[PDB]
């Protein structure tokens, strides 16, 4: 945060500092070739169609001519394996912003990190609608908003509570 | 950087070239600054019986870095059969001389 | 995910920082707008259990206890009638909290008139 | 072996309306609940489609241009239409494409056939007559596949030749209409992509005689020509094209 | 068409996002719009030029999108300031201002 | 009227559509502005003779 | 050469459309003010000073 704001003193608040991308753990090639790995963020090469994503079992009903499925934005969201004729959804790998929640450096040096739009199982752990929050303890009491996190969630210093 | 090459290989002493001595003998970077100088030396670097004192790397496993020099006289495996430091079938010396 | 593309992109400087900063300014401006419009009272007023207002009926604008969203029938109808590196940040105030703010404003203007806007 | 057919009756070819037929899937991509705009070689809506008959004595095997692509419709019963001929000069000078569907299987061959003036198949009242070409010297591509096939059956085909690839699109429709094209919508599924790599400018329809001279079975076919244009296709929740809009037909569809 | 004002804003934002995503499919004068295809088909001296064309096209698209986003943000901010004024003067008091 | 220029311009995508849509929005906005300013009455009143 | 002319003219057109949008926002603000003056000064008597 100090490097991003170009200052040695950071005021109280939330600051967008980085971007978190789930790196491809393996590379998969499927030609009419390697093993098929599902439910993980991997690179894939289906019939010369390259990409990076998470392969999940699909409930789509592809007709026989149809091979790979495109969404509204013409990105490949479903693909048929050319060896075993099954349909797989391609969800984009988990990416999000990394924001650092901190009070003033005059007050404390403790920080918490927010992974925006990222579930907590793909990264003091607390799951919010805004994303996964690490380093802040969740309390059942309600206070006024000090540092805004999002989706009704706010953070404060008293340790850092959410 | 001084060396002696062929007459058709003087186009390969340049940034961004594809070629043989560019890959396995002498590579220039894409952000290279400087000057390449070439002149004919048939009166000095040639003999009527054959001047074989100038050698080039015919065989290598991978392309060089820019400003990378390979003087290692290790054998090359050009086939599936390992060579074990011994010449043979698909086992060639990497350094061959200009005639 | 291309490293070479990012290396070439670094030659253009801090354009990406400018665009991210502008989008961040817009994103915080939206939350500031919602605070300015809806969060004008620091007291959460509530209506009395008995709806005796001298013949005036406010059932269509007061929150419905039967609905889980705690919205008014008009607000429920309004919500029903509205239908590659990109992320959508959630709003700071959720829909139930905005509905709660409107409910507090409605309770204040029904039970207290304009007095709650100027003081106690 | 070649045989001249000299018992034909002279009649001009007819014309009729295309309605909303001739739409094929432009690609192999699944799309669901979407409206997709594509610019491709399509048959225009409500266009003038040429009508040819086979009735007894009509036997319509003329020489037709191919142009950018050909839509071929068939109101067929009792299996008279058997295949197509593609090429430029239709002789041994150039290389030509043969598509036939005999009693057993579908055969596609790319050879320099010396074609007959009247290529045909025959049914004896069993198939024991085949007179299409007299020779085949240089063959590059062979492909043997499954059988593709009141008028009871409607056969739609789209033939395109782009980048040396011959795209054949097909659709089989159960119909009960007596004479003309039914009014409705049916998207043509892609049937085959052939890497033939040959020049095609002319094509021929292959028919089958009935022998008991010769007798022509009751059949009717329609020829339409493709033009480069844009269509708006509607994909339902099941990935089937259910409706289409011609972008250049009228200002409402535009 | 009672709720057209909110639906207009929703449609404009969704259309801007769809246009910005759609602009990635354009090659902007390069041989292809896919970065992986360029990186796998060409050497880095010419792939640098193709990637540069893609970068300048996408950067122009993103700057354009940010520009209309800022203009729409100004319009929405003006509308929100008006809405806050109406909340203060019509709901929290009785206004003598006509219409 | 240059067809080669339009063929090269198609490589840049939907920039022209965005510019046309923005100008169309401005053009309808001017009419909306005039409608909001002047058309505040639905009865055309006249002074007595 | 045509690509250079296209990018120059496209940059000019984007600049023109952007400044037209900014002026359109300014004119819209002025028109909203004019509508407010029409409602409050012409269609009624205003207690707002100046
Ligand atoms: C206030 O208005 C509500 C809604 O208009 C009234 O609720 C209706 O009551 C009648 C009589 O029991 C029912 O037939 C309707 O179905 C009710 N409408 C709804 C939407 O529930 C209510 O009675 C009115 N009066 C009071 C004192 O609340
Ligand atoms: C069937 O008829 C066609 C057309 O009349 C015959 O084709 C002709 O063959 C002669 C052979 O001497 C050529 O000189 C003509 O130029 C051909 N005409 C055309 C239009 O191609 C064909 O030979 C006949 N078949 C048989 C078996 O006689
Ligand atoms: C079809 O074309 C023929 C001549 O080519 C013409 O006589 C006929 O009227 C046309 N039909 C329609 C519907 O345009
Ligand atoms: C159909 O054609 C194939 C290809 O020549 C042939 O082998 C087969 O015997 C034919 N069948 C009949 C019934 O003629
Ligand atoms: C085509 O066939 C003729 C005669 O059969 C032969 O002379 C010629 O070489 C062949 N060409 C090719 C390309 O096979
Ligand atoms: C195909 O054939 C036609 C006529 O024979 C000719 O005009 C055209 O140039 C040919 N095209 C190719 C690609 O050979
Ligand atoms: C899609 O398929 C389902 C069967 O799962 C069917 O019930 C539904 O009616 C179909 N939709 C259309 C538009 O045909």
Describe the structure.
The structure is cut from a larger assembly and holds seven copies of chain A. The radius of gyration of chain A is 21 Å and the shape is elongated. Chain A is an all-beta fold. Chain A is built from one helix and 14 strands; from the N terminus they run αββββββββββββββ. Chains in contact: A-C, A-D, A-E, B-E, C-E, E-F, E-G, F-G. The interface between C and E is medium-sized, with 32 and 38 residues. The structure holds a molecule of 2 linked components (NAG-NAG) (2 copies) and 2-acetamido-2-deoxy-beta-D-glucopyranose (5 copies). One 2-acetamido-2-deoxy-beta-D-glucopyranose binds at residues 236-238 of chain D.
Helix content of chain A: under 10%
Biggest chain contact: C-E, 32 and 38 residues
Q: Using the alpha-carbon principal axes, give the shape of chain A.
A: elongated
Write the H/E string of chain A, N to C.
HEEEEEEEEEEEEEE
- The end-to-end distance of chain A, rounded to whole angstroms, is 20 Å
Strand tally of chain A, please?
14
Q: Could you tell me the strand content of chain A as a percent range?
A: 35-45%
Bound ligands, named by name, code or SMILES: a molecule of 2 linked components (NAG-NAG), 2-acetamido-2-deoxy-beta-D-glucopyranose
Q: Largest beta sheet of chain A: what is the strand line-up?
A: 2-3-4-7-6-5
Number of helices of chain A: 1
Based on CA atoms alone, the radius of gyration of chain A comes out at 21 Å
**Oligomer kind:** part of a larger assembly
For the largest beta-sheet of chain A, the strand count, sense and barrel status come to: 6 strands, mixed
Structural class of chain A: mainly beta
């Amino acid at each position: 945060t100090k490097c991003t704001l170009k200052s040695f003193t950071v005021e109280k608040g939330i600051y967008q500092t980085s971007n978190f991308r789930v790196q491809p753990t393996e590379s998969i090639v499927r030609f009419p070739s390697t093993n098929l790995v599902k439910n993980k963020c991997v690179n894939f090469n289906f019939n010369g169609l390259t990409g990076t994503g998470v392969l999940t079992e699909s409930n789509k009903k592809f007709l026989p001519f149809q091979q790979f499925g495109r969404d509204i934005a013409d990105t490949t969201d479903a693909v048929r394996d050319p060896q075993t004729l099954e349909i797989l959804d391609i969800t984009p790998c988990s990416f999000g912003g990394v924001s650092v929640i901190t009070p003033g450096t005059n007050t404390s040096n403790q920080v918490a990190v927010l992974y925006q739009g990222v579930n907590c199982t793909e990264v003091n752990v607390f799951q919010t609608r805004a994303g996964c929050l690490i380093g802040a303890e969740h309390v059942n009491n309600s206070y006024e908003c000090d540092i805004p996190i999002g989706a009704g969630i706010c953070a404060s210093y008293q340790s850092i509570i959410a | 950087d001084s060396f002696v090459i062929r007459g058709d290989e003087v186009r390969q002493i340049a940034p961004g070239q594809t070629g043989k001595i560019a890959d396995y003998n002498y590579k220039l970077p894409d952000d290279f600054t400087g000057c390449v100088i070439a002149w004919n030396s048939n009166n000095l670097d040639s003999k009527v019986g054959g001047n074989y004192n100038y050698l080039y790397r015919l065989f290598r496993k991978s392309n060089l870095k820019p400003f990378e020099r390979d003087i290692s006289t290790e054998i090359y495996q050009a086939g599936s059969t390992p060579c074990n430091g011994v010449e043979g079938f698909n086992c060639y010396f990497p350094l061959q001389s200009y005639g | 995910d291309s490293t070479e593309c990012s290396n070439l992109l670094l030659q253009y400087g801090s354009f990406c920082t400018q665009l991210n900063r502008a989008l961040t300014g817009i994103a915080v401006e939206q939350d500031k707008n919602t605070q300015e419009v809806f969060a004008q009272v620091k007291q959460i007023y509530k209506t009395p259990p008995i709806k005796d207002f001298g013949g005036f009926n406010f059932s269509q604008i007061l929150p419905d206890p039967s609905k889980p969203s705690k919205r008014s029938p008009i607000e429920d109808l309004l919500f029903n009638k509205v239908t590659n590196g990109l992320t959508v940040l959630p709003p700071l105030l959720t829909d139930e909290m905005i509905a709660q703010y409107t409910s507090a404003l409605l309770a204040g203007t029904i039970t207290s008139g304009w007095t709650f806007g100027a003081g106690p | 072996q070649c045989v001249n057919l000299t018992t034909r009756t002279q009649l001009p070819p007819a014309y009729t309306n295309s309605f909303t037929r001739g739409v094929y899937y432009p690609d192999k991509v699944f799309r669901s609940s979407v409206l997709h705009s594509t610019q491709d070689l399509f048959l225009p809506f409500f266009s003038n489609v040429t009508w040819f008959h086979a009735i007894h004595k009509r036997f319509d095997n003329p020489v037709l241009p191919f142009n950018d692509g050909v839509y071929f419709a068939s109101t067929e019963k009792s299996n008279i239409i058997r295949g197509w001929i593609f090429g430029t000069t239709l002789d041994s000078k150039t290389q030509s494409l043969l598509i036939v569907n005999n009693a057993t299987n579908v055969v596609i061959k790319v050879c320099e056939f010396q074609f007959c003036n009247d290529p045909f198949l025959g049914v004896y009242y069993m198939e024991s007559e085949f007179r299409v070409y007299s020779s085949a010297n240089n063959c590059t591509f062979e492909y043997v596949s499954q059988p593709f096939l009141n008028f009871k059956n409607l056969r739609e085909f789209v033939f395109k030749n782009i980048d040396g690839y011959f795209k054949i699109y097909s659709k089989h429709t159960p119909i009960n209409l007596v004479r003309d094209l039914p009014q409705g919508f049916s998207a043509l599924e892609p049937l085959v992509d052939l890497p033939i790599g040959i020049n095609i400018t002319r094509f021929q329809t292959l028919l089958a005689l009935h022998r008991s001279g010769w007798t022509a079975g009751a059949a009717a076919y329609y020829v339409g020509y493709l033009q480069p244009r844009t269509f708006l296709l509607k994909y339902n929740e099941n990935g089937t094209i259910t409706d289409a809009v011609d972008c250049a037909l009228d200002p409402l569809s535009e | 068409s009672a709720l057209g004002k909110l639906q207009d804003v929703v449609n404009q934002n969704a259309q801007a996002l769809n246009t910005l995503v759609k602009q990635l499919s354009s090659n902007f004068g390069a041989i292809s719009s896919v970065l992986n295809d360029i990186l796998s088909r060409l050497d880095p001296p010419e792939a640098e030029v193709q990637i540069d064309r893609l970068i300048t096209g996408r950067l122009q698209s993103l700057q354009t999108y940010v520009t209309q986003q800022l203009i729409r943000a100004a319009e929405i901010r003006a509308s929100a300031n008006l809405a806050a004024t109406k909340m203060s003067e019509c709901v929290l008091g009785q206004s003598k201002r006509v219409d």
